[PDB]
């Protein structure tokens, strides 16, 4: 479709304009995000049995939920953690691309089918069923400047003005608060309960009776007696609202005529709902909002929209309430996308320049200039049309694709140049006969190149997502590039090229330009003589080539393998873990040391330290902590010692010294939860009745036997917690029945007192909150305190617990886990410094087999799936290779003549390969898309020379040894522009220091090394590659 | 119809047509929400509601018929149970509250079968005795000693105020306000003056638009600009067929 | 037998608070009356899925449902997805006088 | 004249139709018994029928 689009110009114009309008508008509407969603989905059921103990919770709640979990379509497995804090969480992981919402309710339907089998007390609290990512998203904290409010204060004002609003927004699939909404707290004193002769039970009962909302009918209610004129509602008792109010509750009335009130035997007080989560902001008190993302949410959308929900809130915020932002995995994405757009521009300028340095008028130079927005614009129009998003992957796809655009453009132009200089032809007729001289060229080129890229969308994992992300960005790029190259570029070559006088290669013109033309044609002649000169020795460079191939395969096996390079995300984190029982104090001492380091010893780089005592990626506990660290701006810390690498390095090096504390500071493993690298994750399943202990032991036997092969396996350690002592209280029941005391009374006062108790609700300034009942602190602090507590026997006599109880110390885990219904213990290790996850896993399996009866093994998460290259990525090459060869046969119509270009491929891999080992770099995803890029590009290079040459053997009938070079000179001018324009445009990435750097670098250098060698080798090898393939056959 | 119904005293009676289709009467003006954005309570939202409602009937030149879509606080009959009296007499607050409710409000007890279908069983004071405040004391609950105590004994009844249709808008207490852009004016301007008037209201009260005024409709926004783009598109196809730059404009 | 505040306290509020992470929701109206009724209505994006949107809501409901009174879920709640005006209203009358 | 004709021209969505059915709302004070309301529905239906 060329000579016609050449006769009609403004029409091609119009097609182009349309395409640009499209891609430009699909920039405006496309989801500008970080990556594609890669998590296999997870739904999560979550319960709470307050005052319970990991086994009471794992028995009573955990198990009766797991068993009622079946016929949930597409489920992968079921993790179940159950802790001494009385929490349970259960998480079902599903097929990737399985439906988030469907998958969600199968689970909740199966839940309420168990739900009536959970205790009273655990669904009074209620369960939850969220569908959500595992890491956060961004965490706004709230602090008071004015001092006019504490931390439980702040916490409440968010959990009564902010959390509810924020949470309601879409894609916002779990909110975790940093402190607690208020609850009315009744702190029962035991000496005084026993004094007026009351149990906790009496308190609890009074509260239910006298803090209640009764419905009491109407006046003149349907059906009324005829002639009733009035219809009023009746209001009875109503909820309570104040501390004072709860104060005056009537516990009893003595014979004396006495009043006993609630505040007569307890501290009434507006308190936090729970008291374990305590936050600080640079060691000032603070609360805030831990925000998770729901499997399928929703880009800079969700989070611009959280500043949306919060815009309306700042208005009514009291005296000193200020937002602070200690964690924004947000403007990261923003300046990554920025740093892509920049390099797109720099490519435009540098190419406009190389363009100018070869084709020395501004018209020729502007031609491929205009041809670039068009094609790049167009591709956002298509990334709306097949589903994808303006993310990192997509953007680097765009920046890669820059080249295989510039090439088709370049040839379209420079071939007309060649045509005119060598003819005197009138520009339009020139390019008419010139585009008909390169049509099948650029076209088949599109065919084979897309043939290299397409079979990488194929296929699986969490890992093939990415490969699709690129494969289609880049194949779209292909067809767009080439169609423009047939519609637009021939046309734009027709209407813009200034007439050339035949032969004139700019000799006697100006100063430098003339010298450039002269020395170039000089060098090209030098070069035709050079290649003809390697044609007289056809068999030497063949052995040299085979050398190259050996070196290639070596370079390739000695080269290690990365997924995605870790980045300085501007934020990072710290975990703290103390022994057990390990009070809240001790933990706060350690969070205090830590934040001391970040604030003193690092002022140049640290921007904030949101730190939370009582919370920590494993579960809750008095002995767990975390710091979300924000880092100073990107420029404000230049150099390696200032980026998360060295920063967290020294951090951790220094924390090392904290005794009685594992403290680690980490970076964010690339994105979200996608750290399904970093080694493995092994599960020990209890596959007979063995019990807890024998699984603990066999766990140790493994853990031991693997620290006894530190040469395929290191750091092999349990991800659990260990058995802290627990305080058993035996109720000799017969004693109780003898004394007249109810096991109801007994167990209930035990629990109410030391564990707390949700009684009923109240209203606090127009919001409903809880009412809790519990022993004031002094009397539930020490074992002897057990006997301090009296329950009333049926005869009216207060019996002390010391009477019927029998207390003693025991052992047992504070975080029971199950894996698929069965008891399990989780085991986290590494393939030893030089070894593969496959081998490490293997020795792990072997060691595990030599373990007692009943114990079985299962792999999960990381090691379940298991990743990339070394499996089938080279075989999907292979199929893309028989595909490439197929299209090659298709265009050449020879069986050998394909191989003339197939042998051109290693010439490119051999330069990338180098570039990687010589950089410290590695074989990552970016490298492999760089690799593909390399090989389909060198295919462009080669295919064009052999096309020209066999077009000479078939149209002129000029035998190979002559035609090859007659065309190799005819292509030496173009092959050079493309390559120079390329290696200079991809300089930005291998250049960019910080801010998406690692990724940028990784994409760049592979393609650069690859290119330097692909050109300066194939430029000699391929005119030999074809003569070899043309002579040995037919 | 409506002209005639006009005359009915003690009765708003209106007769309307069906606003075009289903629920698609997201025209006919606006719908404004007064959100209680601090602890203020019912009353102070009632008051500030009035302050708005008033200040807008004091610009009948961008805004008319500005009125609440709620109902207003009819008197309700509070019954206080002096609980100490009850514990002195031997009567259970369970007994007490339950007889109160059963009697004047009714009570779903359990089911029965009526000609092969399950229906309910309800329990409730026959009409004569739940018709008038004095009737409260007519009602006896049995103390633990076996003595019927009358409600007149432990209760203390008195008249109060409070809305018969509390609304909330997004979790928070709210009052809904329905008005019009004055005969010649636009919903945009009416909404604007509504917002301005609302800003000059006490602390805690916040405003939000919904339904009708949330979205907000058609021409004057982007319908002429989607023309405009259809115009550069039309001109594009025009250049395409003519292959002239002027000749389109013809 | 309830009263607009007993219903708006006891039922309305303990339902609204257990309403989050419902994808695509626009807002939440809540009326609560001296007849002891409550209705709560969630409006969604146009073209959002009727059925999906429907159960996110009911799932979040039963997650509050055990916090409503005995007497209010003895009656039971409902979660319908429905237009606001009617459609057509067939009435039934007796000619014979043989039924009220 | 075109631009003038166009700005002076007001703007409708969909024109209301005689749908063959229509409706009436009644609202009395409070407490306002069932009787009183039925008196008013009685007057109303009296109009529509007579």
């Amino acid at each position: 479709m060329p000579n016609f689009f050449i006769d009609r110009p403004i029409f091609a114009w119009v097609i182009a304009i349309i395409i640009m309008l499209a891609g430009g508008l699909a920039i405006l509407k496309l989801p500008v995000a970080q990556y594609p969603t890669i998590a296999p989905p997870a739904v999560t059921i979550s319960a709470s049995y307050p005052g319970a103990d990991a086994k009471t919770v794992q028995d009573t709640v955990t198990q009766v939920i797991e068993q009622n979990m079946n016929g949930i379509d597409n489920l992968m497995y079921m993790s179940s953690n159950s802790d001494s804090t009385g929490t349970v969480q259960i998480t079902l992981t599903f097929e990737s691309g399985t439906d988030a919402d469907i998958a969600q309710v199968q689970v909740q339907n199966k839940l309420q089918l168990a739900m009536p089998l959970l205790p009273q007390e655990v669904q009074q609290q209620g369960v939850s069923v969220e569908k959500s990512s595992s890491s956060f998203l961004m965490v706004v904290g709230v602090i008071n400047t004015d001092g006019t409010m504490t931390q439980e204060d702040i916490s409440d004002y968010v959990a009564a003005n902010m959390k509810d609003a924020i949470s309601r927004t879409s894609g916002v699939g779990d909110v975790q608060l940093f402190g607690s909404q208020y609850a009315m707290r009744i702190w029962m004193n035991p000496n005084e309960l026993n004094k007026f002769q009351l149990t906790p039970v009496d308190v609890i009962t009074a509260i239910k009776a006298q803090n209640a909302q009764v419905a009491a009918g109407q006046l003149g209610g349907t059906p009324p007696v005829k002639g009733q004129q009035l219809n009023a509602s009746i209001i009875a008792q109503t909820r309570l609202t104040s501390t004072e109010e709860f104060g005056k509750i009537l516990l009893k009335v003595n014979q004396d005529g006495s009043r006993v009130l609630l505040r007569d035997v307890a501290k009434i007080e507006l308190g936090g709902e729970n008291y374990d989560i305590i936050a600080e902001f640079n060691g000032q008190p603070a609360s805030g909002l831990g925000i998770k993302l729901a499997t399928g949410a929703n880009a800079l959308d969700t989070a611009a929209a959280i500043r949306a929900e919060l815009a309306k809130m700042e208005p009514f915020f009291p005296s000193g309430l200020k937002i602070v932002y200690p964690y924004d995995t947000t403007p990261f994405v923003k300046i990554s996308i920025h740093e892509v757009v920049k390099t797109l521009v720099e490519a435009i300028i540098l190419v406009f320049l190389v363009m100018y340095l070869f084709l020395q008028n501004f018209r020729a130079t502007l031609i491929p200039t205009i041809a670039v927005p068009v094609v790049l614009l167009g591709t956002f129009a298509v990334l709306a049309a097949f589903g994808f998003s303006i993310n990192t992957l997509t953007m680097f796809g765009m920046v890669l694709a820059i080249g295989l655009l510039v090439d088709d453009a370049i040839v379209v132009v420079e071939n007309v140049e060649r045509v005119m200089a060598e003819e005197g032809l009138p520009p339009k007729e020139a390019t008419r006969k010139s585009m008909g001289q390169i049509q099948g060229a650029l076209v088949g080129i599109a065919m084979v190149l897309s043939a290299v890229f397409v079979p990488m969308a194929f296929f699986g994992g969490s890992t093939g997502a990415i490969y699709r992300q690129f494969s289609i960005t880049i194949v779209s790029a292909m067809a767009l590039s080439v169609l423009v190259a047939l519609i637009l570029t021939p046309a734009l070559c027709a209407t813009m090229l200034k007439p050339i006088a035949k032969g004139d290669h700019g000799e006697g013109k100006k100063g430098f330009f003339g010298w450039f033309n002269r020395m170039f044609e000089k060098s090209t002649h030098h070069y035709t003589d050079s290649v003809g000169g390697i044609l007289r020795s056809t068999g030497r460079y063949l052995v040299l080539y085979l050398i190259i191939v050996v070196g290639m395969a070596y370079l390739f096996v000695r080269l290690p393998s990365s997924f995605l390079p870790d980045e300085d995300q501007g934020v990072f984190m710290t975990m703290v873990q103390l022994p057990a029982g390990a009070t809240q104090e001790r933990t706060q001492k350690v969070l205090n040391e830590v934040t001391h380091y970040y604030l003193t010893k690092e002022k140049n780089n640290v921007e904030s330290v949101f730190a939370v005592n009582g919370f920590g990626f494993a579960g809750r506990g008095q002995n767990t902590g975390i710091a979300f660290v924000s880092l100073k701006d990107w420029a404000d810390r230049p150099g390696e010692e200032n980026k998360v690498e060295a920063i967290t390095m020294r951090a951790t090096r220094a924390f090392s010294q904290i005794k009685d504390a594992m403290v680690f500071a980490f970076n964010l493993p690339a994105i979200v939860e996608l750290g399904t690298a970093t080694g493995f994750d092994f599960e020990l399943i209890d596959q007979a009745g063995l019990g807890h202990e024998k699984l603990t032991q066999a766990r140790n036997q493994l853990l031991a036997e693997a620290a006894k092969h530190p040469d395929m396996l290191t750091s092999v350690r349990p991800n659990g917690l260990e058995d802290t002592p627990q305080f058993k209280i035996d109720i000799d029941q017969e004693k109780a029945q003898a004394l007249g005391v109810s096991i109801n009374d007994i167990n209930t006062t035990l629990g109410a007192a030391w564990g707390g108790s949700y009684v009923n609700d109240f209203i606090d300034r127009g919001r409903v909150k809880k009412v809790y009942v519990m022993s004031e602190a002094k009397y539930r602090m020490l074992p002897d305190d057990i006997g301090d507590w009296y329950v009333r026997a049926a005869d009216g006599q207060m019996v002390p617990f010391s009477a019927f109880s029998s207390s003693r110390w025991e052992y047992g885990s504070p975080r029971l886990e199950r894996y698929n219904g069965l008891p399990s213990m989780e085991i986290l290790g590494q393939a030893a410094p030089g070894k593969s996850t496959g081998e490490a896993m293997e020795l792990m399996e072997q060691l595990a087999s030599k373990l007692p009866t009943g114990v079985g093994y299962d792999w999960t998460g990381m090691s379940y799936q298991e990743r990339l290259s070394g499996n089938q990525a080279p075989s999907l090459y292979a199929i893309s290779l028989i595909v490439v060869f197929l299209c090659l046969a298709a265009l050449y119509e020879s069986w050998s003549i394909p191989f003339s270009v197939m042998l051109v491929v290693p010439l490119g891999v051999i330069g990338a390969l180098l570039a990687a080992t010589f950089r410290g770099l590695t074989n990552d995803v970016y490298f492999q898309v760089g690799l593909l890029t390399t090989i389909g590009l060198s295919a462009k290079n080669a295919i064009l020379i052999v096309e020209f040459a066999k077009d000479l053997m078939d149209k002129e009938g000029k035998g190979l040894i002559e035609a090859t070079l007659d065309a190799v000179r005819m292509r030496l001018r173009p092959i050079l522009m493309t390559s120079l324009a390329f290696i200079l445009g991809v300089m930005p990435l291998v250049i960019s220091t910080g801010a998406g750097s690692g990724a940028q670098n990784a994409v760049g250098t592979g393609v650069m090394g690859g290119m330097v060698t692909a050109t300066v080798l194939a430029i000699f090898f391929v005119p030999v590659f074809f003569v070899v393939v043309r002579r040995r056959f037919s």
Side-chain angles (χ1 to χ4, degrees), chain A:
Chain A
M1 1 171 58
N3 2 89
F4 160 66
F5 262 103
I6 274 163
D7 245 328
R8 238 182 157 142
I10 305 186
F11 191 92
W13 269 126
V14 169
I15 278 201
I17 298 158
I18 293 162
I19 292 178
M20 287 195 317
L21 285 198
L25 273 57
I27 219 77
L28 320 167
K29 248 306 285 178
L30 220 58
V32 207
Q34 194 178 333
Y35 285 151
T37 332
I38 269 153
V43 196
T44 336
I45 319 203
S46 336
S48 164
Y49 190 9
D53 60 79
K55 142 165 283 296
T56 295
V57 227
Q58 191 253 203
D59 286 348
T60 262
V61 213
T62 299
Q63 300 203 12
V64 55
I65 293 196
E66 300 179 345
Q67 277 151 9
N68 284 260
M69 289 304 129
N70 349 263
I72 308 175
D73 309 320
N74 272 259
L75 130 166
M76 248 162 70
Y77 41 81
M78 163 185 62
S79 125
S80 177
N81 310 323
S82 351
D83 36 339
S84 278
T85 139
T87 341
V88 180
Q89 250 173 16
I90 292 147
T91 317
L92 302 98
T93 339
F94 291 69
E95 305 324 86
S96 204
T98 219
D99 190 337
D101 322 79
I102 299 293
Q104 155 164 107
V105 201
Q106 296 163 140
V107 187
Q108 192 244 359
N109 137 259
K110 285 298 272 183
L111 211 199
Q112 330 203 261
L113 195 120
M115 263 274 283
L117 278 165
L118 296 193
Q120 175 51 44
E121 298 106 7
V122 95
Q123 21 133 217
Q124 242 228 303
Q125 296 266 341
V127 324
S128 349
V129 188
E130 336 86 12
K131 55 147 193 298
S132 78
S133 99
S134 40
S135 32
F136 288 100
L137 191 168
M138 58 98 97
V139 179
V140 152
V142 207
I143 55 89
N144 176 276
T145 84
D146 270 12
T148 79
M149 47 192 63
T150 108
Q151 90 89 20
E152 353 261 348
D153 249 313
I154 289 192
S155 281
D156 184 72
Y157 188 72
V158 318
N161 279 67
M162 312 181 59
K163 155 142 158 44
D164 245 53
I166 286 334
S167 198
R168 264 192 284 284
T169 303
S170 163
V172 197
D174 177 37
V175 164
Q176 185 51 62
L177 182 91
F178 289 141
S180 216
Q181 166 162 248
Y182 278 155
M184 173 90 356
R185 293 325 236 84
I186 308 317
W187 300 118
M188 32 182 46
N189 184 94
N191 307 340
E192 259 175 342
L193 275 180
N194 166 90
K195 175 152 142 190
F196 308 98
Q197 327 236 304
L198 322 110
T199 51
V201 189
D202 301 19
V203 165
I204 308 203
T205 295
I207 307 182
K208 305 184 163 190
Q210 307 189 33
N211 179 25
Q213 193 78 16
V214 28
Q218 306 186 2
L219 260 166
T222 33
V225 317
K226 318 159 119 224
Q228 156 94 6
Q229 308 296 344
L230 136 150
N231 176 224
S233 214
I234 291 202
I235 312 288
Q237 310 173 29
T238 170
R239 287 259 198 256
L240 271 68
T241 34
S242 162
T243 141
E244 168 182 353
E245 296 214 68
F246 272 98
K248 14 179 170 197
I249 302 192
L250 192 55
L251 282 175
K252 76 182 189 104
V253 256
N254 275 286
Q255 315 224 355
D256 153 68
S258 253
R259 256 213 258 233
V260 188
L261 314 182
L262 230 202
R263 42 119 165 146
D264 284 330
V265 298
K267 299 191 166 179
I268 276 79
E269 159 198 306
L270 201 62
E273 219 151 57
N274 96 85
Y275 289 75
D276 319 83
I277 323 152
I278 279 188
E280 271 137 9
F281 187 26
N282 300 336
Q284 166 165 8
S287 165
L289 279 171
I291 299 185
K292 282 188 193 173
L293 185 109
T295 326
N298 276 312
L300 195 158
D301 308 58
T302 298
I306 274 14
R307 184 47 240 270
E309 259 302 328
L310 217 102
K312 298 160 51 231
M313 297 199 218
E314 306 164 34
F316 314 108
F317 281 13
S319 38
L321 240 220
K322 164 168 309 195
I323 312 288
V324 305
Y325 293 93
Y327 202 87
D328 222 4
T329 95
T330 277
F332 169 73
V333 183
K334 219 178 175 186
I335 320 198
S336 169
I337 248 50
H338 194 92
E339 285 284 325
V340 146
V341 158
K342 258 168 194 169
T343 90
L344 284 163
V345 157
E346 291 145 11
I348 283 215
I349 305 161
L350 262 52
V351 156
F352 196 105
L353 297 200
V354 172
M355 282 303 310
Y356 194 76
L357 217 81
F358 275 53
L359 318 187
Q360 299 144 333
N361 191 277
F362 249 80
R363 271 161 95 101
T365 257
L366 213 78
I367 288 186
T369 286
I370 329 171
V372 138
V374 175
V375 191
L376 216 119
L377 265 192
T379 328
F380 302 120
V382 201
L383 292 160
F386 274 158
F388 310 167
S389 40
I390 309 169
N391 59 30
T392 309
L393 297 194
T394 280
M395 294 324 280
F396 285 158
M398 305 274 81
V399 193
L400 278 158
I402 299 178
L404 282 142
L405 197 178
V406 306
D407 207 342
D408 276 308
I410 278 171
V411 169
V412 170
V413 185
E414 91 89 40
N415 233 73
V416 188
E417 300 313 316
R418 179 162 298 284
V419 154
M420 275 179 302
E422 296 166 335
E423 269 270 20
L425 258 43
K428 196 174 186 168
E429 218 41 59
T431 188
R432 221 201 282 252
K433 324 307 270 71
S434 152
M435 260 289 309
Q437 199 268 326
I438 57 177
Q439 200 153 341
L442 321 162
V443 167
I445 266 176
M447 217 314 99
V448 285
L449 278 33
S450 302
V452 346
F453 295 111
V454 149
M456 220 57 56
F458 308 154
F459 38 83
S462 68
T463 305
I466 305 88
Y467 279 149
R468 214 153 171 173
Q469 294 299 335
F470 285 95
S471 200
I472 320 299
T473 341
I474 293 166
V475 169
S476 48
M478 276 291 146
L480 293 161
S481 154
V482 188
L483 260 163
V484 161
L486 216 97
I487 289 161
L488 189 84
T489 79
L492 262 60
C493 284
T495 13
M496 303 194 162
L497 300 173
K498 257 212 285 280
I500 301 298
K502 180 185 188 174
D504 196 84
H505 289 60
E507 322 290 351
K509 359 245 72 178
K510 47 186 302 173
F512 163 70
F513 261 168
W515 146 269
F516 193 92
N517 310 357
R518 286 171 229 132
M519 67 78 64
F520 181 46
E521 296 285 322
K522 178 182 187 176
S523 308
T524 66
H525 236 147
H526 257 260
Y527 162 78
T528 69
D529 285 341
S530 304
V531 161
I534 76 192
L535 284 180
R536 303 171 314 185
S537 59
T538 301
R540 181 161 61 128
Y541 300 95
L542 283 56
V543 204
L544 179 82
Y545 159 81
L546 294 171
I547 298 186
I548 301 171
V549 189
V550 183
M552 194 216 75
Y554 184 62
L555 253 169
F556 198 91
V557 277
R558 196 178 181 97
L559 190 67
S561 296
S562 169
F563 185 27
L564 265 238
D566 296 35
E567 296 268 350
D568 188 37
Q569 287 205 33
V571 298
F572 65 90
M573 274 181 285
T574 303
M575 285 297 310
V576 196
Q577 305 272 0
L578 274 78
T583 23
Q584 187 177 358
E585 246 153 330
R586 315 214 315 240
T587 328
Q588 175 76 111
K589 157 196 215 308
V590 182
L591 280 130
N592 272 333
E593 306 193 27
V594 165
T595 324
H596 184 280
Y597 180 95
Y598 284 95
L599 294 170
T600 82
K601 293 231 205 133
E602 197 84 63
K603 314 176 210 91
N604 0 2
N605 319 298
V606 159
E607 174 60 333
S608 71
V609 190
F610 199 93
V612 280
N613 189 313
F615 189 116
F617 279 110
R620 289 190 246 274
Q622 263 192 33
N623 48 43
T624 192
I626 144 173
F628 304 74
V629 166
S630 203
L631 285 160
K632 279 232 176 196
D633 205 291
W634 305 105
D636 305 353
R637 335 101 60 186
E640 270 215 42
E641 319 86 329
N642 286 332
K643 263 71 174 173
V644 275
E645 212 152 354
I647 285 201
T648 72
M649 199 276 179
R650 276 178 274 95
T652 220
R653 139 169 305 178
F655 292 137
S656 54
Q657 158 258 352
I658 307 198
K659 180 169 176 284
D660 304 340
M662 150 221 144
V663 195
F664 287 106
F666 46 104
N667 193 44
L668 320 187
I671 201 225
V672 185
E673 57 205 74
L674 196 54
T676 70
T678 71
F680 74 72
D681 168 10
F682 182 86
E683 210 86 47
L684 228 67
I685 279 177
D686 177 24
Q687 223 136 1
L690 307 186
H692 183 17
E693 328 80 4
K694 295 164 248 162
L695 221 195
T696 300
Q697 291 163 14
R699 205 272 323 263
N700 291 338
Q701 184 167 314
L702 211 50
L703 280 208
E705 275 298 319
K708 290 168 48 165
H709 277 52
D711 59 79
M712 326 227 163
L713 270 58
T714 191
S715 214
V716 276
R717 76 220 149 81
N719 175 82
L721 313 186
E722 335 299 330
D723 317 13
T724 108
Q726 316 154 343
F727 195 66
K728 169 99 183 183
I729 341 185
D730 251 278
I731 295 308
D732 151 33
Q733 296 255 349
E734 202 173 349
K735 216 97 176 187
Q737 263 195 357
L739 300 174
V741 262
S742 172
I743 306 102
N744 279 40
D745 298 346
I746 292 193
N747 279 331
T748 293
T749 64
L750 180 47
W754 297 65
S757 230
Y758 179 78
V759 192
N760 66 347
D761 298 312
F762 81 117
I763 297 294
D764 170 77
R765 283 115 57 183
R767 181 181 254 274
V768 70
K769 293 144 179 194
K770 322 201 155 31
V771 138
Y772 276 109
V773 119
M774 198 184 196
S775 179
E776 204 224 316
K778 319 216 303 140
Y779 312 83
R780 46 154 171 87
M781 214 41 59
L782 288 169
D784 282 351
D785 298 334
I786 305 275
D788 275 24
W789 279 92
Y790 299 73
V791 37
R792 168 165 50 74
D795 55 41
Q797 294 163 8
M798 314 307 308
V799 176
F801 251 68
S802 73
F804 46 63
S805 95
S806 334
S807 63
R808 49 162 228 261
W809 282 85
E810 277 201 317
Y811 264 139
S813 156
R815 170 238 166 74
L816 270 41
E817 11 133 11
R818 320 184 55 90
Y819 184 93
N820 293 323
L822 313 154
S824 207
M825 297 207 192
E826 172 177 55
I827 293 159
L828 278 42
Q830 296 269 313
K835 284 213 157 202
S836 57
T837 297
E839 298 169 294
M841 275 178 39
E842 226 168 344
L843 173 52
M844 284 285 302
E845 304 193 356
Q846 284 121 230
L847 285 164
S849 88
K850 298 282 274 295
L851 271 224
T853 299
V855 201
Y857 76 108
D858 222 87
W859 293 104
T860 167
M862 302 175 182
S863 55
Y864 182 98
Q865 36 134 57
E866 217 186 351
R867 286 253 279 244
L868 220 171
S869 188
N871 181 37
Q872 295 296 327
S875 191
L876 304 154
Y877 286 16
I879 77 111
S880 198
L881 126 90
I882 289 313
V883 163
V884 156
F885 172 79
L886 266 239
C887 317
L888 284 172
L891 203 74
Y892 291 152
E893 280 282 332
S894 186
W895 284 116
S896 76
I897 301 179
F899 285 92
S900 58
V901 158
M902 287 239 139
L903 289 215
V904 101
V905 162
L907 300 159
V909 186
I910 193 50
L913 274 172
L914 289 161
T917 320
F918 274 116
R919 229 288 196 184
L921 258 50
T922 159
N923 176 25
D924 63 316
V925 158
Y926 294 119
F927 177 73
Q928 253 151 330
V929 314
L931 255 179
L932 265 44
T933 302
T934 282
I935 79 159
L937 214 153
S938 4
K940 235 192 173 309
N941 276 10
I943 283 163
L944 257 174
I945 280 199
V946 344
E947 181 78 49
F948 273 9
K950 193 187 171 283
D951 283 332
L952 254 203
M953 259 182 38
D954 285 19
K955 202 231 168 178
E956 256 61 77
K958 294 177 177 171
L960 52 147
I961 214 184
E962 180 249 314
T964 45
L965 69 84
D966 220 341
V968 155
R969 73 118 201 267
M970 192 108 85
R971 201 102 293 257
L972 193 274
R973 163 142 116 150
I975 303 163
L976 278 234
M977 308 168 56
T978 281
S979 204
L980 179 70
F982 205 87
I983 312 178
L984 290 173
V986 313
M987 224 144 66
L989 331 169
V990 43
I991 270 44
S992 189
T993 73
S997 195
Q1000 274 179 88
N1001 292 329
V1003 151
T1005 89
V1007 106
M1008 190 181 68
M1011 190 84 198
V1012 168
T1013 80
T1015 18
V1016 318
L1017 265 62
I1019 197 48
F1020 299 114
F1021 274 76
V1022 109
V1024 162
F1025 273 141
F1026 173 87
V1027 303
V1028 161
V1029 144
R1030 196 70 272 231
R1031 277 181 190 267
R1032 174 90 179 180
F1033 285 73
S1034 172

